[PDB]
């Protein structure tokens, strides 16, 4: 519906890169929210606010004046603390409920085989939570799988390899009402 | 590292000097919700369906860059102008979907270890440049505060064509070239 953003605090009074990022960590939806901001100067985080600490802390010596100044101003420290509710809790319970937490893309399964063996390709799905299984008649652990591949366009793909030479690749995904089974030919 | 079910990066401000280069993005579970075009002052959603459901005032992101541009000038005058060295990026080309000859597909070039976030990524079809039908994402942040970026190329998988992903960066004495053909594995 409407997204809320984290506002970084300001400093008082040859190529360089400055980074700021505000992170919201969710566990049981909104029952456990952790809120962290990071101030980076040339690949060196120097000031970080962490909701587990409750105040700004100097990561390196360069950030001691900035952390002390921001924590000494009550109106500044209280604005940063309240961002766990005005940003993290608001975005999860609000716009993300209509967008990210609702996006579901059904996976595509192909069962082509080749060895130097019998790999199952599960492509284009969302979210990344997925379970792939091998079962000719009963599932065999044996077998290695690739890491979760992030396509970058809100889709994922994964490749599971069956080390062993009527087979079925079993896939369970939150987007599927029933698990997908494909009749492998070898 | 922090363990959680979801990570919402509601605000990523990156600014570079000289050149007056900025970028503001929103992330959820590692994927880009949108970026604020700092020149047009408009919000650009990666998924067009998300823009139809949610919204975001881009002026908030613009004033987010105004803060980091201010803090960077103060930090430059504090660290006695200490710049960060350039890094050599690494590229990886792989297809989005299982390759089927004649069926349209998308080629992905994953360039990682990008710092500073300034790069020149281009595609080549049979040693000839192709500029039409190419999409490029923003700079995603890494945990070591370096960056990575993905480029896309829609193509028709033929048995003859040879594709290259050319990467030009300040940390490269020679451009990096990653190859891909229709009969490869990765």
């Amino acid at each position: 519906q409407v997204y809320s953003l984290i506002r970084p605090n300001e400093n008082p009074a040859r190529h360089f890169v400055y980074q700021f990022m505000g992170e919201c960590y969710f566990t049981n939806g909104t029952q456990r929210i952790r809120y962290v901001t990071r101030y980076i100067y040339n690949r060196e985080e120097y000031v970080r606010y962490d909701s587990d600490v409750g105040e700004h802390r100097a990561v390196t010596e360069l950030g001691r004046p900035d952390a002390e100044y921001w924590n000494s101003q009550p109106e500044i420290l209280e604005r940063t603390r309240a961002e766990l509710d005005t940003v993290c809790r608001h975005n999860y319970e609000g716009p993300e409920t209509h967008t990210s937490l609702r996006r579901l893309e059904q996976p595509n399964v192909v069962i082509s085989l080749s060895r130097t063996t019998l790999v199952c390709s599960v492509t284009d799905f969302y979210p990344a939570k997925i379970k792939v299984r091998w079962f000719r008649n009963g599932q065999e652990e044996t077998v290695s799988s690739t890491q979760l591949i992030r396509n970058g366009d809100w889709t994922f793909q994964v490749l599971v390899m069956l080390e062993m030479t009527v087979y079925t690749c079993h896939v369970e995904h939150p987007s599927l009402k029933s698990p997908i089974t494909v009749e492998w030919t070898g | 590292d922090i363990e959680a079910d979801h990570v919402g990066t509601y605000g990523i401000s990156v600014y570079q000097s000289p050149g007056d280069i900025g970028q503001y993005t929103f992330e959820f579970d590692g994927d880009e919700l949108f970026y604020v075009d700092l020149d047009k002052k408009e919000t650009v959603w990666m998924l067009p369906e998300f823009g139809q459901l949610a919204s975001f005032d881009p002026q908030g992101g613009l004033q987010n860059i105004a803060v980091v541009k201010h803090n960077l000038g103060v930090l430059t005058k504090r660290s006695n102008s200490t710049p960060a060295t350039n890094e050599a990026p690494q590229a990886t080309v792989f297809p989005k979907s299982p390759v089927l000859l004649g069926q349209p597909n998308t080629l992905i070039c994953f360039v990682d270890n990008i710092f500073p976030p300034v790069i020149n990524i281009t595609w080549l079809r049979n040693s000839k440049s192709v500029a039409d039908g190419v999409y490029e994402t923003s700079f995603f942040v890494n945990r070591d505060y370096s960056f990575h970026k993905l480029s896309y190329l829609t193509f028709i998988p033929s048995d003859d064509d040879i594709y290259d992903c050319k990467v030009e960066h300040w940390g490269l004495e020679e451009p990096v070239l990653k190859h891909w053909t229709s009969g490869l594995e990765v």
């Epitope: 809320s4 008082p12 109106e75 309240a82 | 002026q59 004033q63």
Partner: T-cell receptor
Framework: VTLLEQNPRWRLVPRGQAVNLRCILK??????MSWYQQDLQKQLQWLFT????????VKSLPGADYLATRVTDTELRLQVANMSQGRTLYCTC????????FGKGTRLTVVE | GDSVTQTEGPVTLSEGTSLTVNCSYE??????LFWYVQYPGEGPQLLFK?????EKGSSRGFEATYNKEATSFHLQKASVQESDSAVYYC??????????????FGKGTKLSVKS
């Protein structure tokens, strides 16, 4: 005391003429400078908010065309052209934690 | 945060009575509520602010409650005075949305206190 300084206080503006206004910031802890408009019916409305030097924003509402500029760290300008209805323009300053402080204001009177 | 509805003035009270200026806000993001007073020959100046919801801010004899339940910010004073004859504005600002230093004002309520 006064954290801002806005000049002039009054202005007689012929119809269709342009007006240039100034505002000087006197406190560094209030860097977010803004322009607010109060019409003849005493209705306050936010116009711009400029922070970094070189910012340039345009707003065109009925009665006056605006053009605000943040020249330096403490200089805030505003040009009001094609004016056909009188109004008052207040220069304001505030920190990021919203605490807006209004100046004395500049009353613009349009005469035909 | 679109609108802020305020009590339609003018309010005429006798010195010693109690003031009650209603205000109801309508927003989509967490706001910070304000009360501004403008005297007949001055500019609008901040009376008090309430950043935290379900709390109350006080200035002179004026009080207002950040009632998040009913989305209200009613201004109340026990004993009004002639010197308080001015126009009062209900205002808010989004804590995590849009531009900074951006207040949304109501239409304003005029107060006239006769001795």
């Amino acid at each position: 005391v006064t954290l801002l300084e806005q000049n002039p206080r009054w202005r007689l503006v012929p119809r269709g003429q342009a007006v240039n206004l100034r505002c000087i910031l006197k406190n560094s802890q209030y860097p977010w400078m803004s322009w607010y408009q109060q019409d003849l019916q005493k209705q306050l409305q936010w116009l711009f908010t400029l922070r970094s030097p070189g910012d340039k924003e345009v707003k065109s509402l009925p009665g006056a065309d605006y053009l605000a500029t943040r020249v330096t760290d403490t200089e805030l300008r505003l040009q009001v052209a094609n004016m056909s209805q009188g109004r008052t323009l207040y220069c304001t300053c505030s920190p990021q934690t919203t605490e807006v402080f209004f100046g004395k204001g500049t009353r613009l009177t349009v005469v035909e | 945060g679109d609108s802020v509805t305020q009590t339609e003035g003018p309010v005429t009270l006798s010195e010693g009575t109690s003031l009650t200026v209603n205000c109801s806000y309508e927003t989509k993001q967490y706001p910070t509520l304000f009360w501004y007073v403008q005297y007949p020959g001055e500019g609008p100046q901040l009376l008090f602010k309430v950043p935290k919801a379900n709390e109350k801010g006080s200035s002179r004899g004026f009080e207002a409650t950040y009632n998040k339940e009913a989305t209200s910010f009613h201004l109340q004073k026990a004993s009004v005075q002639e010197s308080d004859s001015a126009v009062y504005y209900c205002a808010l600002s989004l804590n995590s949305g849009g531009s900074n230093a951006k207040l949304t004002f109501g239409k304003g309520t005029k107060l006239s206190v006769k001795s």
